[PDB]
Amino acid sequence: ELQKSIGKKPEPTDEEWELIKTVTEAHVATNARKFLPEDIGQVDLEAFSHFTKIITPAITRVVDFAKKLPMFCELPCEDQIILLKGCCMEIMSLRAAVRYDPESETLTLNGEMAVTRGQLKNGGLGVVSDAIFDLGMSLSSFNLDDTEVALLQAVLLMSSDRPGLACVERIEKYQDSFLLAFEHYINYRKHHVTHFWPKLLMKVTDLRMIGACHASRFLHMKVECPTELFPPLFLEVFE
Ligand SMILES: Oc1ccc(Oc2c(Br)cc(CC(O)O)cc2Br)cc1C(O)NCCc1ccccc1
């Protein structure tokens, strides 16, 4: 914070280089093409089908990342549950968004399937599609590596704001540790875009929205499409 007054812009402590070693390994371990015909999407029940055939593995990989982080494993059992449930979609939207490519204008879902904005949207996501795309478009320019996505993810995971969490103080603290190892890692990367870090923290807000905006969306679907249509893990994590 005095280093912050002098504009010293520090790079990570050795102790911190550990944290970066782990989240990037946890992340690369679990981050994983085929264009889904313009045929599908163009509620579409066939777009519905194709995107829920593949979401159960996506969710486990997001869990497998949290398992690989040891700060996560220090938490009581009902708290672990609660975090995973919160960021599950948040983490998931980012993971897709950074795999935008503007030539085709497609994301890559689950690391295989390549969807346009209308295709993802018509399978039941509505504006939650537009949010994940608009985002991936903006992150085109930020040029994130596995380590930054990893840390962003680890910031999302450790969100003491979740309803019914018990170990708030400790989780918050863990989070500040990722944010500090993250900001120091940005400093170290020297990105050519003024206020890179402020700009990047607003992506946390937008991802937080998407997750929310997806839960609401999921209530509009529960109405018309019965619960029977939904992969049992998806249900356990979004209900
Ligand atoms: O719910 C979803 C969540 C993610 C999704 O795309 C993905 C998938 Br699949 C996986 C991931 C993680 C990854 O890319 O590895 C991100 C994203 Br974005 C597609 C749907 C989807 O089309 N389901 C529609 C049924 C439904 C569910 C919730 C709300 C509204 C409608």
Swiss-Prot record:
GO cellular-component term (any): RNA polymerase II transcription regulator complex
UniProt binding sites for L-thyroxine: 61, 110, 214
Key words, A-Z: Deafness, Disease variant, DNA-binding, Metal-binding, Nucleus, Receptor, Transcription, Transcription regulation, Zinc, Zinc-finger
Outcome of substituting residue 33 to Q: Impairs hormone binding and ligand-dependent conformational changes
Impact reported for residue 96 to T: In GRTHD; impairs hormone binding
Keyword Zinc recorded: yes
An annotated GO BP: thyroid hormone receptor signaling pathway
Main location (coarse class): nucleus
Domain NR LBD: 15-239
Subcellular location field: Nucleus
Annotated phenotype, changing residue 134 to R: Stabilizes homodimer
KW Zinc-finger (keyword) present: yes
Binding positions (3,3',5-triiodo-L-thyronine 1): 214
Annotated positions binding 3,3',5-triiodo-L-thyronine: 61, 110
Location of the region described as Interaction with NR2F6 in the Swiss-Prot/TrEMBL record: 34-239
Domain of life: Eukaryota
Consequence when changing residue 32 to T: In GRTHD; impairs hormone binding and ligand-dependent conformational changes
Annotated GO MF terms: chromatin DNA binding; DNA binding; DNA-binding transcription factor activity; DNA-binding transcription factor activity, RNA polymerase II-specific; enzyme binding; nuclear receptor activity; RNA polymerase II cis-regulatory region sequence-specific DNA binding; sequence-specific double-stranded DNA binding
Phenotype when changing residue 110 to S: No effect on thyroid hormone binding
Domain remark from Swiss-Prot or TrEMBL: Composed of three domains: a modulating N-terminal domain, a DNA-binding domain and a C-terminal ligand-binding domain.
Disease: Thyroid hormone resistance, generalized, autosomal dominant: An autosomal dominant disease characterized by high levels of circulating thyroid hormones (T3-T4), goiter, abnormal mental functions, increased susceptibility to infections, abnormal growth and bone maturation, tachycardia and deafness. Affected individuals may also have attention deficit-hyperactivity disorders (ADHD) and language difficulties. Patients have normal or slightly elevated thyroid stimulating hormone (TSH).
Subunit structure and binding partners: Binds DNA as a dimer; homodimer and heterodimer with RXRA. Interacts with the coactivators NCOA1/SRC1, NCOA2/GRIP1, NCOA7 and MED1/TRAP220 in a ligand-inducible manner. Interacts with the corepressor NCOR1 in absence of ligand. Interacts with C1D. Interacts with NR2F6; the interaction impairs the binding of the THRB homodimer and THRB:RXRB heterodimer to T3 response elements. Interacts with PRMT2 and THRSP. Interacts with TACC1; this interaction is decreased in the presence of thyroid hormone T3.
Function: Nuclear hormone receptor that can act as a repressor or activator of transcription. High affinity receptor for thyroid hormones, including triiodothyronine and thyroxine.
Similarity remark: Belongs to the nuclear hormone receptor family. NR1 subfamily.
Name the record gives this protein: Thyroid hormone receptor beta
Species whose genome carries this gene: Homo sapiens (Human)
Residues of the full protein shown: 203 to 460 of 461
